[PDB]
Design a protein around this nucleic acid. Sequence first.
DNA 1: GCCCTTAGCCCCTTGACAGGCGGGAAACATCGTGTTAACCTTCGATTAAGAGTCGCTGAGTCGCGACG
Length: 52
Amino acid sequence: QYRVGLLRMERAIKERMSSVDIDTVMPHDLINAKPAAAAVREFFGSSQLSQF
DNA sequence: GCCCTTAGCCCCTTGACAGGCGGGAAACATCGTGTTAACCTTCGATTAAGAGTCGCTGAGTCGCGACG
């Protein structure tokens, strides 16, 4: 599930890096963190394996 | 024992507030528009390790006969 979240984050970073230039760019400014923690939250929030 | 006189209770008249829903007038936070023009002109899941049956389609096999 973290690999799925990382694939989503990679898609987001690929969609966002085309707009923001890489030369003189603020570090880690295009990498998102919502789908990273959202995947583990769903895994521990309402997953069938983490049900109880 | 009954009638007259006076006191207490009930009722009426006025009223000086108090503020209180509510529209208006105003000061201030919404909600639908625009507008800008420097680069990519196919994104992506999701069953599919049981099970009884409804509704449609399209291939290979035969009859009936005509023309040599």
